[PDB]
Every structure is written in C-alpha cells, then in structure tokens.
C-alpha cells in the first residue's frame with residue numbers, strides 16, 4: 001500500500017489553528033473529567049492508539065485512514081476507555097466537518113501535549129479517510145504484562161529504536177490506569193496532567209514493590225501511592241534502556257527534544273508526503289494567542 005498525503009481542499013495553517021483553538025478551549029472547559037485530571041491524557045492515549053496499529057512490513061494500519069471510527073477498531077479490547085476521548089472530539093468534528101478523522105484524532109494528541117505544558121510538536125495535515133475494509137484487525141496494540149525484550153521487539157514493527165521507545169514511553173506520567181478499562185489501577189506520578197520528566201525520576205527514585213491487584217494482574221506499587229506496569233518496569237531491567245532513562249531524569253530538555261521528534265514520527269508513519277506539500281505546522285498555544 002502507498003498512502004499519499006492529500007491536504008483538505010482549500011485549507012491553510014489558519015484553518016488548522018482554529019481546530020486547535022477549539023480543542024484547547026474545550027480542554028480548559030471540561031477540567032472536571034476523571035477527578036479533575038481533565039481530557040488531556042485520554043487524548044494523547046487516543047492519538048498513540050490510532051497510530052500504533054501500523055505495520056511497517058505491508059503499510060497496513062497507522063493514523064492515515066481514521067479507521068478508529070469503525071466498529072471493529074472502536075470495540076478493540078485494547079482501546080477500552082478511549083470512547084470518552086472520541087465523544088469529546090465529536091462536537092469539534094461537527095463544527096469543522098472538512099477535517100479528516102486521522103487529522104482530528106492526531107491533532108487532539110498534539111493539542112493536549114502543548115496545552116499540558118509539553119514540547120511543541122510539528123504537525124502535518126493530509127490523512128485521508130479510508131473504507132471500513134481497511135480497518136486493522138484487533139491485537140496489534142501491546143500487552144502490559146511483559147518484559148523489555150517484548151517492548152524492543154514490539155516497537156521495531158513501528159520502527160522505533162531504543163531512544164524513541166524510552167522518550168515516547170515518558171508520556172505515561174500522564175493520566176492514570178483504570179481497573180474497569182485495563183485490569184490495572186493507579187497513577188504513574190503526582191503531576192498527572194502537566195508534561196514533565198517525572199516518569200523517569202519515579203522509576204529511578206522510588207521503592208517499587210511487585211504486588212497483584214484486584215483484577216489478578218501484577219503491578220509495581222511504590223510507598224507514595226504510584227504504580228508502574230511490568231512493561232514500564234522493564235526499562236530499568238534493560239541496560240540500554242536504563243542509561244536513556246537516566247539521561248532524561250537528569251535533563252528534561254533532552255527529554256522534550258526527543259519526545260517531540262519521536263511523537264511526530266509515530267503520527268506520520270505510513271504516510272507519503274509529496275514535496276509540493278505544506279511544511280509541518282507549529283501551532284500556537286491559547287496562551288501564546290492571548291485566548
């Protein structure tokens with residue numbers, strides 16, 4: 001498969017900044033969601049999940065086709081809980097009906113990160129909606145109960161190397177796990193809706209204890225009340241990952257620089273961009289516009 005990027009006919013940078021401004025003003029408004037965590041975390045989880053189905057071998061899956069809108073992917077067990085992110089965005093799609101789904105789902109992700117004080121992420125437009133028969137089968141998103149060998153191997157299918165995997169994984173400082181959605185329960189840290197390098201400092205500085213939970217899944221619990229999944233804990237079990245974890249616990253700006261570069265790569269995998277295409281857009285924040 002080749003998927004070439006097609007810009008929504010007639011639209012420019014100013015059209016997209018209005019969709020951003022709309023998502024961002026609704027984030028500020030619906031701040032009570034999940035015990036005042038807000039929707040920022042579920043929206044970067046939805047953008048990684050629509051992108052994380054990509055297969056580098058045959059170019060199936062990925063953000064391009066906006067196929068999460070279809071039943072098979074929408075009802076994937078690994079996507080449980082993302083329906084709240086979908087319903088949040090649905091009014092914004094009625095307001096700006098010209099934007100494609102893959103462009104809206106991925107721009108929700110970019111807007112959430114910049115509005116939770118994270119790095120600026122360059123974004124590109126052009127994903128085109130594709131038919132129901134292009135919806136990837138379930139079972140391509142990753143399990144939680146596994147080790148660093150499983151992680152290295154899983155992320156090579158999206159051709160992410162070790163540094164890109166540790167940088168991308170830091171976006172778990174955000175939000176919390178929910179027993180009813182995943183069989184796991186608890187937050188990764190204190191600042192769960194501001195973007196910081198806290199995931200790396202917690203993994204190196206806490207006294208983690210392996211325990212089972214009420215769903216019979218294991219997880220690492222610390223004294224502080226935080227939790228990590230087995231796959232997260234793995235990053236300090238592997239020596240290549242552990243050095244990169246140390247670097248980011250000591251330099252939040254190297255963390256932000258590399259997260260940025262990797263998160264745009266994850267959102268553009270599987271998409272061919274012509275060079276008549278617009279350069280990547282750097283959207284301003286509400287604060288930068290005075291809104």
Ligand code: HEM
Pocket residue numbers: 041042044045048080081142143144145151168169171172174175176177178179180181182183184229231
């Ligand atoms: C091997 C990798 C990963 C596994 C096993 C994994 C698994 C999970 C699980 C079990 C949850 C909680 C679901 C719930 O109960 O609601 C979760 C939440 C989340 N994930 Fe991941 N994750 C992985 C990678 C990533 C990556 C790469 C990102 C982002 C770039 C990410 C971002 C998030 C966010 C923001 C949440 C919070 C969701 C919320 O608050 O509702 N995850 N993840």
